[PDB]
Amino acid sequence: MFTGSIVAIVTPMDEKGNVCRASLKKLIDYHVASGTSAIVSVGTTGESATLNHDEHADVVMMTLDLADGRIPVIAGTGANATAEAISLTQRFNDSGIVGCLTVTPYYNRPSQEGLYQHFKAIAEHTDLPQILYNVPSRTGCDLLPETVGRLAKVKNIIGIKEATGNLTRVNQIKELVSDDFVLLSGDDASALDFMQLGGHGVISVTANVAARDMAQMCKLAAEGHFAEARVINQRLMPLHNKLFVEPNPIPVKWACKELGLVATDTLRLPMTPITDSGRETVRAALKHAGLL
Amino acid sequence: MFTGSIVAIVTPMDEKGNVCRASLKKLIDYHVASGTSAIVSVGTTGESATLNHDEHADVVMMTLDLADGRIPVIAGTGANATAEAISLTQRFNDSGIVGCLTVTPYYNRPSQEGLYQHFKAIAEHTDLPQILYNVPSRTGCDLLPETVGRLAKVKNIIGIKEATGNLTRVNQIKELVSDDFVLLSGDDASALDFMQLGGHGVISVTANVAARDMAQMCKLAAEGHFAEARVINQRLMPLHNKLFVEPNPIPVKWACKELGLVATDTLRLPMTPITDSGRETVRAALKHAGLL
Amino acid sequence: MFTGSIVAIVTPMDEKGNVCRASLKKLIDYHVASGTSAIVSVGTTGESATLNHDEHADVVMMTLDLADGRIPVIAGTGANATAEAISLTQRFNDSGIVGCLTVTPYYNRPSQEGLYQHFKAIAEHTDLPQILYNVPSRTGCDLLPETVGRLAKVKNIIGIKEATGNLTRVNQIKELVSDDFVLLSGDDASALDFMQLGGHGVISVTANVAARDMAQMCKLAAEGHFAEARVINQRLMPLHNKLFVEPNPIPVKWACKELGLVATDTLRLPMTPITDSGRETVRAALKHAGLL
Amino acid sequence: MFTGSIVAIVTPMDEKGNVCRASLKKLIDYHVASGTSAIVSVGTTGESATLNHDEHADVVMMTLDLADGRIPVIAGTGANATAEAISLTQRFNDSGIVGCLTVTPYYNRPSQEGLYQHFKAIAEHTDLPQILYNVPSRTGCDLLPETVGRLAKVKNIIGIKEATGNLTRVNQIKELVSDDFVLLSGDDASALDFMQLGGHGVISVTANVAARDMAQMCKLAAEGHFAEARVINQRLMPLHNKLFVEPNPIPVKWACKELGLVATDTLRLPMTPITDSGRETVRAALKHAGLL
Ligand SMILES: N[C@@H](CCCC[NH3+])C(=O)O
Ligand SMILES: N[C@@H](CCCC[NH3+])C(=O)O
Ligand SMILES: N[C@@H](CCCC[NH3+])C(=O)O
Ligand SMILES: N[C@@H](CCCC[NH3+])C(=O)O
Ligand SMILES: N[C@@H](CCCC[NH3+])C(=O)O
Ligand SMILES: N[C@@H](CCCC[NH3+])C(=O)O
Ligand SMILES: [Cl-]
Ligand SMILES: [Cl-]
Ligand SMILES: [Cl-]
Ligand SMILES: [Cl-]
Ligand SMILES: [K+]
Ligand SMILES: [K+]
Ligand SMILES: [K+]
Ligand SMILES: [K+]
């Protein structure tokens, strides 16, 4: 499933930075019960950078196992080296995942032609649906609509997580692609506007802690009931912003701990513990959302 | 040492994308002959992103072997996961490399506290000198002077490659650190300016193909002969700019090939071959520098 | 009238840079016939900067006279000095204009409090409806939604021309103001997206030469027929962009001359004649729109 | 002359917002006493925007009178309409002012060709020396080095106030113009750096309240005593920054008042009185500089 509220799920960790199966199970049961459309496993919010390839694969396989067919799972498979991306994708072929979320290469700043060749190569060697992922603030490069248009002609490149927050991209891309290409926001604070302009859903950080409201908001949006969706959005907006008061996923992991959804808010370096000022800001945003 | 013209050396590859020893040997001999002060092995220009950890170490060890004590070798050791950075650093402990060049984590956007803890942890697991590396356009993260000041208090954190091209950083950092902390430009087009403001050298892409000019320019700068150095800078300025006409190291590898310095200009995806327009642009810049 | 397609009308000039009454009449008759909602007289596209206060007032009074009650006229009354703005407004009190369009002070970069006091003062000394105008790329300052919210409580501050192209501003402002506050795009290329998000119209440069299509597009948008409006938008999009290939109003004046709507494309310094390359680009955009 | 510490002088006003001669006289005497090299009258810090043309000329003539040949006076003559700039310039022809400071047109965003024609036209209507002024953050327009080079070929275009804070401009412009073209900083925080790179002085806001320190710092810089000059710069750096804590000249006028240099800190709308938090911030900065 590639519409509605899709959770960019945290990788819950114990005090030693190892994946906490009990906490992960609780999260997955929570999303099943709360109407989340799908789970993105080991994406940006899942600390993809600080898990090695084996750990990365373990978390995805564990998420699939715990999901037990009750909610679709999309694997984070992005890499800044084309060989690494292909290799990661091969690990998940025939795993039970429904799709892959694959970010533009970061740090090395490839050309648009390089992005084309990167994603074409990755798509060539799997039958899995591929969701492209653009987030220039993180990567140093910007996958432009023209190139998204080219890539969409590849059979199994079926959508994009557009995280710029630049809302003009919705219809610039939509115009260049077929009607079944999925446009998904990757920016919680502008996600409702993104849907109102033609987007089909959101891959959301806020959904980790406001799953039901996010699910309802996205359904109302899909139905054209924007004023109704916007009331929900207004109560989530502090959360949409303040979950980034310190680097994601620091705030959202702390929020999950505070709600009792995970056992510890531990991360891996270079992420560090939430500051006291950060706790207060996030707590206030949670209360505004009606969650505490 | 950590002064003068330091080359950000390409990793020359054969048509299959593997390191070409003959070409690497030719490059290192050229830098020895040219007066290059040191070599950064498997930095950004050396395609650190698309070499796996073992391949990366092999290239560094090969470069060190081929240098044969004639020219100091600095290993690229940056990673966006602290555990990976430590592991990479540990490979070169007691190896013969004189220091490490280590980039702020990319993609995951750590806070300034995260940068502090990341670089501190790394420095603690080695006796090797550490040169911090800031390049926000690639990483999505900006290591600020205040934090550089904090880190410079760690015994073996001894310098910074400052690639912002924001020249106010030179004196902002200099006032926060001791006189023996090295300030190196990571931006060829502004490097002479950077030196004129008190910088000690440059980790250069241009030096790959104009090693003798670059070495001489940095010498003049160190001696305070800025007008003289500027004449060289002006001859080199088209290269400083046009070596980024397409994503580095696509242009510089082609230039190396054109100059007969390497056998092939092959790269690894997502870097792709230089365009015809790029070739013509880079060739004109080489002609302007009097290298062709 | 403060909804639909509102034309940011050119001030047509003879070869000596003086207002050309015959050309102005032709433009005004064209907008009456073509379904334009209203005319903004001596706004940005009308060369407000290079008309002295007397010339400025003359053009507005002439536009009113030629309009002869067939189409509403809004006066550009913006100034970067509060006294100048008030004084300009007093000239038009009881003139027959329906409203004023008043830009944030430019060059002097006032605070949000200064913007508040500026616009409050101006509104205090007229009964005329006031439309605020935000265009940071021109002015060096940015009227934020919070301050728009404050100002909207002033009886006769009734809307905003939001020209950032930042589409998040639509609902950030809408949430803070009453349901009858008018939100108008000041960015042709993003104007349809702006309306789709809740905006009520556009103060348009493109409307100078594609009046009928703009009128229909905005009506379809107001009716919720976005896919239909978007077909029209796609054929105007080259024009939306290329009317800014050289500084506005250089391209649009040339376009009006080429269509026979005005006698000469003359401007005042510091605007200068369109380049040959500019003519070709604009001509191609006109043909794409079906206008030549 | 057009060298050293040049004050961007405030236009001190009485409570009614009109120029206060006694305060202006006190300021000019202070600059004479302090070693300030020249005064810019009714530049940006002098509230050029909110003085009408006659009021502006009166302030310039008053300043010139009060200077009484003891200190050179440069008139602010910029305008965004070329005809206005010429007219303002013509007021000071054969007056005793030694030159004009003329800003790129603001708001209307002319092309580089428009800048060329605007400044050329102005220079042609005067014998007075012309200092170009680039400050894109206020104007929406950026006068590039190439165009500065073009204009420097005009006999009486003799310098630039470069307020971008982008230090690469110093040597980019210097290589395009003759050795007697003056390079002046318009950015206090980076001005010493600007001078260290080859700039000849600064048109300073800080100099309003720290005239003696600024003059001495620029003298040391001109003599190549940069380390010595930096000690002064560091004492002044909080002022360099915090005089922009609220929009200039709100902070500097309050500082003048606090120091007893002017009778009131009154400004004209849209500038508004300093906030209490602003006062405390500016006072700490003055204390740091040892002026309080
Ligand atoms: N830290 C590296 C390797 C990731 C390993 C798989 N999750 C990166 O962010 O690309
Ligand atoms: N970058 C490699 C990818 C091969 C796939 C290996 N897992 C190439 O050029 O073919
Ligand atoms: N592609 C990964 C791993 C690099 C491995 C060592 N060169 C990264 O850029 O972080
Ligand atoms: N050129 C000045 C005066 C405008 C006179 C009235 N249109 C400005 O742009 O503010
Ligand atoms: N800026 C003036 C405006 C007065 C209106 C004169 N036309 C003030 O503070 O009152
Ligand atoms: N406020 C107008 C006119 C200034 C008149 C002379 N000081 C402007 O800033 O252009
Ligand atoms: Cl994700
Ligand atoms: Cl490097
Ligand atoms: Cl307008
Ligand atoms: Cl000034
Ligand atoms: K497809
Ligand atoms: K140290
Ligand atoms: K109102
Ligand atoms: K000259």
Residue from B52, B53, B80, B106 to probe ligand 1 pocket by mutation (most atoms less than 8 Å from CB) = B80
Please, which residues bridge with residue C19 across strands?
C13
Neighbours of chain B (3+ CB pairs under 8 A): A, D
Listed in sequence order, the DSSP H helices in B35-103 are 53-67, 82-92
Please, which residues bridge with residue C252 across strands?
none
Which of D189, D193, D230 has its CB closest to that of B167? D193
Q: Is C45 annotated as a binding residue?
A: yes
**Using CA atoms, how far apart are residues D11 and D59, in angstroms rounded to an integer?**
8
Residue from A200, A148, A193, A194 nearest A175 by CA: A148
Please, which residues bridge with residue B99 across strands?
B74
- In DSSP notation, chain A reads --SEEEEE----B-TTS-B-HHHHHHHHHHHHHHT--EEEESSTTTTGGGS-HHHHHHHHHHHHHHHTTSS-EEEE---SSHHHHHHHHHHHTTSS--EEEEE---SS---HHHHHHHHHHHHHT--S-EEEEE-HHHHS----HHHHHHHTTSTTEEEEEE-S--THHHHHHHTTS-TT-EEEES-GGGHHHHHHTT--EEEESGGGT-HHHHHHHHHHHHTT-HHHHHHHHHHHHHHHHHTTSSSTTHHHHHHHHHHTSSS-----TTS-PPPHHHHHHHHHHHHHTT--
Cα angle at B269 between B265 and B271, to 5 degrees?
55
Q: Which amino acid is at C148?
A: V
**Using CA atoms, how far apart are residues D87 and D93, in angstroms rounded to an integer?**
10
- In DSSP notation, D77-124 reads ---SSHHHHHHHHHHHTTSS--EEEEEPP-SS---HHHHHHHHHHHHH
Interface residue ranges in chain C relative to chain A, Cβ cutoff 8 Å: 165, 167-168, 170-171, 175, 189-190, 192-193, 196-197, 230, 234
What is each CA distance from B58 to B7, B75, B78, B82, C220, in whole angstroms? 19, 11, 16, 21, 64
Atom of ligand 4 nearest to the CA of C50: 1
Chain breaks in chain A (C to N over 2.5 A) after: none
Q: Quick one: DSSP state of residue B265?
A: -
Q: Residue B73: which H helix or E strand, with range?
A: strand B73-76
Does ligand 3 lie within 6 Å of residue B49's CB atom?
Answer: yes
Does ligand 6 lie within 6 Å of residue D53's CB atom?
Answer: yes
Please, which residues bridge with residue A204 across strands?
A7
Residue from D109, D133, D269 nearest C104 by CA: D269
- Are C264 and C13 spatial neighbours (Cβ–Cβ below 8 Å)? yes
Helix (H, G, I), strand (E, B) or coil at B166: coil
Retrieve residue D181's tokens. Answer: 């073209």
Is the previous residue joined to B12 through a cis bond, with omega within 30 degrees of 0? no
Cα angle at C125 between C120 and C127, to 5 degrees?
100
Residue C222 CA, distance from chain mean position: 19
Retrieve residue A212's tokens. Answer: 């039901």
Nearest C-alpha in C relative to D117: C270
Total Cβ atoms within 10 A of residue D37: 21
Residue from D44, D45, D84, D135 to probe ligand 6 pocket by mutation (most atoms less than 8 Å from CB) = D84
Pairing outcome for strands D201-204 and D4-8 = parallel
Q: Residue B100: which H helix or E strand, with range?
A: strand B99-103
- Are B211 and B34 spatial neighbours (Cβ–Cβ below 8 Å)? yes
Q: Which amino acid is at C73?
A: V
Dihedral-angle region of residue C96 (phi above 0 means left; psi in -120 to 50 means alpha; beta otherwise): left
Q: For B210-213, which contacts have Cβ atoms below 8 Å and span 24 or more sequence positions?
A: B210/B236, B210/B239, B210/B289, B210/B291, B211/B5, B211/B7, B211/B30, B211/B31, B211/B34, B211/B35, B211/B36, B212/B34, B212/B35, B213/B289
- In DSSP notation, A221-255 reads HHTT-HHHHHHHHHHHHHHHHHTTSSSTTHHHHHH
Backbone angles phi, psi at D272, to 5 degrees: -130, 165
- Are A127 and B286 spatial neighbours (Cβ–Cβ below 8 Å)? no
Residue from D122, D46, D120 nearest D83 by CA: D122
**Using CA atoms, how far apart are residues C220 and A157, in angstroms rounded to an integer?**
33
Q: Terminus-to-terminus CA distance in chain D, angstroms?
A: 30
Residue C179 CA, distance from chain mean position: 22
State yes or no: is B174 an active-site residue. no
Q: Residue B159: which H helix or E strand, with range?
A: strand B157-162
Residues 6+ apart with CB under 8 A from B204: B5, B6, B7, B8, B185, B188, B191, B214
**Using CA atoms, how far apart are residues A202 and A196, in angstroms rounded to an integer?**
12
Is there contact between A and B if contact means ≥3 C-beta pairs under 8 Å?
A: yes
What is each CA distance from A240 to A191, A204, A230, A287, C113, in whole angstroms? 9, 9, 13, 13, 27
Listed in sequence order, the DSSP H helices in B93-225 are 112-124, 136-139, 145-152, 168-174, 191-196, 211-222
Q: Which amino acid is at A100?
A: C
Q: What is the dihedral of CA D91, D97, D98, D103, to 10 degrees?
A: -50
Neighbours of chain C (3+ CB pairs under 8 A): A, D
- Are D160 and D148 spatial neighbours (Cβ–Cβ below 8 Å)? yes
Is the previous residue joined to C72 through a cis bond, with omega within 30 degrees of 0? no
Ligand approaching nearest to the C-alpha of B268: 2
- Are C258 and C289 spatial neighbours (Cβ–Cβ below 8 Å)? no
**Active-site residue, selected from the candidate residues B161, B242, B253, B257:** B161
Residue D172 CA, distance from chain mean position: 22
Positive or negative, the CA dihedral C23, C29, C33, C34 is positive
Does ligand 6 lie within 6 Å of residue D169's CB atom?
Answer: no
Total Cβ atoms within 10 A of residue B57: 18
Residue from B285, B266, B275, B280 nearest B209 by CA: B285
Please, which residues bridge with residue D102 across strands?
D132
Is the previous residue joined to B249 through a cis bond, with omega within 30 degrees of 0? yes
In chain D, the largest separation of any two C-alpha atoms, in whole Å, equals 49
Cα angle at B146 between B143 and B150, to 5 degrees?
95
Half-sphere exposure (Cβ direction) of A102: Cα atoms closer than 13 Å: 33
In chain A, the largest separation of any two C-alpha atoms, in whole Å, equals 49
In chain B, the largest separation of any two C-alpha atoms, in whole Å, equals 49
**Using CA atoms, how far apart are residues B64 and A245, in angstroms rounded to an integer?**
44
Does ligand 1 lie within 6 Å of residue A52's CB atom?
Answer: yes
Total Cβ atoms within 10 A of residue D195: 26
Which residue shows structure tokens 């500026």?
C118
Half-sphere exposure (Cβ direction) of D224: Cα atoms closer than 13 Å: 2
What is each CA distance from C97 to A75, C34, C65, C67, in whole angstroms? 60, 20, 10, 10
Helix (H, G, I), strand (E, B) or coil at B133: strand
Retrieve residue B60's tokens. Answer: 């560094």
Q: For B224-232, which contacts have Cβ atoms below 8 Å and span 24 or more sequence positions?
A: B226/B192, B226/B196, B229/B192, B229/B195, B230/B192, B230/D171, B230/D175
Which of C171, C190, C230 has its CB closest to that of A168? C190
**Using CA atoms, how far apart are residues D4 and D10, in angstroms rounded to an integer?**
19
Which residue shows structure tokens 């056992």?
A263
**Active-site residue, selected from the candidate residues C116, C161, C242, C253:** C161
Total Cβ atoms within 10 A of residue D98: 17
Backbone angles phi, psi at D208, to 5 degrees: -55, -35
Residues 6+ apart with CB under 8 A from D33: none
Which residue shows structure tokens 């009021």?
D55
Solved by what technique?
X-ray
Is there contact between C and B if contact means ≥3 C-beta pairs under 8 Å?
A: no
The secondary structure of C207-276, three-state, reads HHCCHHHHHHHHHHHHCCCHHHHHHHHHHHHHHHHHCCCCCCCHHHHHHHHHHCCCCCCCCCCCCCCCCH
- Are D245 and D281 spatial neighbours (Cβ–Cβ below 8 Å)? yes
Helix (H, G, I), strand (E, B) or coil at D201: strand
Retrieve residue C131's tokens. Answer: 């439309």
What is each CA distance from C71 to A198, A287, C21, C217, in whole angstroms? 34, 51, 17, 19
**Using CA atoms, how far apart are residues A255 and D169, in angstroms rounded to an integer?**
47
Q: Terminus-to-terminus CA distance in chain B, angstroms?
A: 30
Residues 6+ apart with CB under 8 A from B249: B10, B44, B45, B46, B47, B205, B267, B271
Does ligand 1 lie within 6 Å of residue A44's CB atom?
Answer: no
Backbone angles phi, psi at B213, to 5 degrees: -60, -45
What is each CA distance from C273 to C125, C146, C247, C259, D114, in whole angstroms? 39, 40, 10, 17, 9
Residues of chain B in contact with residue D196, where contact means CB-CB under 8 angstroms, are: 196-197
Q: Residue D252: which H helix or E strand, with range?
A: helix D250-258
Helices (H) and strands (E) in chain D, counts: 12, 8
Backbone angles phi, psi at A78, to 5 degrees: -65, 150
**Using CA atoms, how far apart are residues D281 and D254, in angstroms rounded to an integer?**
11
> Which residue's CA is the nearest one to ligand 5's atom 2?
C83
Is the previous residue joined to C249 through a cis bond, with omega within 30 degrees of 0? yes
Is the previous residue joined to D249 through a cis bond, with omega within 30 degrees of 0? yes
Helix (H, G, I), strand (E, B) or coil at B6: strand
**Using CA atoms, how far apart are residues D175 and D168, in angstroms rounded to an integer?**
12
**Using CA atoms, how far apart are residues B24 and B256, in angstroms rounded to an integer?**
11
- In DSSP notation, B228-260 reads HHHHHHHHHHHHHHHTTSSSTTHHHHHHHHHTT
- In DSSP notation, chain C reads --SEEEEE----B-TTS-B-HHHHHHHHHHHHHHT--EEEESSTTTTGGGS-HHHHHHHHHHHHHHHTTSS-EEEE---SSHHHHHHHHHHHTTSS--EEEEE---SS---HHHHHHHHHHHHHT--S-EEEEE-HHHHS----HHHHHHHTTSTTEEEEEE-S--THHHHHHHTTS-TT-EEEES-GGGHHHHHHTT--EEEESGGGT-HHHHHHHHHHHHTT-HHHHHHHHHHHHHHHHHTTSSSTTHHHHHHHHHHTSSS-----TTS-PPPHHHHHHHHHHHHHTT--
- Are C268 and C238 spatial neighbours (Cβ–Cβ below 8 Å)? no
Resolution in Å, one decimal place: 2.0
**Burial state string for A210-231 with b = 16 or more CB within 10 A and e = fewer than 16:** bbbbbbbbbbbbeeeebeebbe
CB contact under 8 A, B196 and D193: no
Retrieve residue A146's tokens. Answer: 């023209």
Backbone angles phi, psi at C40, to 5 degrees: -85, 120
Retrieve residue B215's tokens. Answer: 């070495």
In the reported structure, the alpha carbon of residue C232 is separated from the centroid of ligand 8 by a whole-number distance in angstroms of 50
Helix (H, G, I), strand (E, B) or coil at B161: strand
- Are D66 and D41 spatial neighbours (Cβ–Cβ below 8 Å)? no
Listed in sequence order, the DSSP H helices in B36-180 are 53-67, 82-92, 112-124, 136-139, 145-152, 168-174
In the reported structure, the alpha carbon of residue A213 is separated from the centroid of ligand 7 by a whole-number distance in angstroms of 19
Q: Terminus-to-terminus CA distance in chain A, angstroms?
A: 30
Residue from A53, A84, A86 to probe ligand 2 pocket by mutation (most atoms less than 8 Å from CB) = A86
Ordered by where they begin, the domains of chain A are: 1-292 (3.20.20.70)
Q: Which of D146, D196, D230, D232 to mutate to test the interface with B (most CBs of B within 10 A)?
A: D196
**Using CA atoms, how far apart are residues A179 and A194, in angstroms rounded to an integer?**
16
Cα angle at A77 between A73 and A83, to 5 degrees?
150
Residues of chain C in contact with residue A146, where contact means CB-CB under 8 angstroms, are: none
Q: Which of D104, D107, D150, D246 to mutate to test the interface with C (most CBs of C within 10 A)?
A: D107
- Are D6 and D40 spatial neighbours (Cβ–Cβ below 8 Å)? yes
Residue D38, burial from CB neighbour count under 10 angstroms (0-12, 13-18, 19+): buried
Residues of chain B in contact with residue A47, where contact means CB-CB under 8 angstroms, are: 108
Retrieve residue B115's tokens. Answer: 């940068």
**Using CA atoms, how far apart are residues C49 and D82, in angstroms rounded to an integer?**
10
**Using CA atoms, how far apart are residues B58 and B273, in angstroms rounded to an integer?**
24
Lining ligand 4 with CB less than 6 A are C 48-49, 51-53, 56, 79-80; D 80-81, 84, 107
Which residue shows structure tokens 């001859």?
B235
> Which residue's CA is the nearest one to ligand 2's atom 5?
A83
Residue A270 CA, distance from chain mean position: 20
Residue from A132, A40, A122 nearest A84 by CA: A122
Q: E-strand spans in chain D?
A: 4-8, 38-41, 73-76, 99-103, 130-134, 157-162, 182-185, 201-204
